[PDB]
Amino acid sequence: EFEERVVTINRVAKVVKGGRRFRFTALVVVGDKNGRVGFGTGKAQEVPEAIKKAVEAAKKDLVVVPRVEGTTPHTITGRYGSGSVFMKPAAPGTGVIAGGPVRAVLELAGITDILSKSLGSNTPINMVRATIDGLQNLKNAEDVAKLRGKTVEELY
RNA sequence: AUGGAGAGUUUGAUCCUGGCUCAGGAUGAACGCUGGCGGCGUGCCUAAUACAUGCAAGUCGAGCGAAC
Secondary structure: OOEEOOOOOOEEEEOOOOOOOOOOOEEEEEOOOOOOOEEEEEOOOOHHHHHHHHHOOOOOOOOOOOOOOOOOOOOOOOOOOOOOEEEEEEEOOOOOOOOOOOOOOOOOOOOOOOEEEEEOOOOOOOOOHHHHHHHOOOOOOHHHHHOOOOOOOHHO
């Protein structure tokens, strides 16, 4: 019903009074299995109760990503923090591979025609923030038609 | 619109302007070389570098005086 992508569970070796406190920050993408990105981080002792903790406290950070005719409406970027991304269009009837950054952004948008792009670095805390920067800065067909305030077939 | 766009760099993590140390192809090329065979092309790119040369291109009377 909901494509939840739990990337990893960052641990911490707290060097406080206690011998060695264990704090697992379960990282899970809050995707709605449609086209939204979704990102939430927990801090509970139980990963299962921590993964849903960030899914019930952070589920409004997603963005609606529409599709034209099976191809990305506009090749957007991502200038938020170090890690960056890029939207590359492909044919509707295609697929994705492995080797690079995060995979829970274009995989949520069941279309198999978008290539997930994010160089920046490996840090998965400032690389997903740039993906939502471009997703919210995406240009739609009518979205840009209102900008001019004329016809949809008069701005292409 | 066949539709660019990595980082670091600054506290103990940082955002943010800014500049390049640095994820590539190109390299009229040479290069230390392990450079099987070759179609095709460029070749004193360093050099209007100095000067022994082989060396510019020979002929003709329908119009005139060889021995022929």
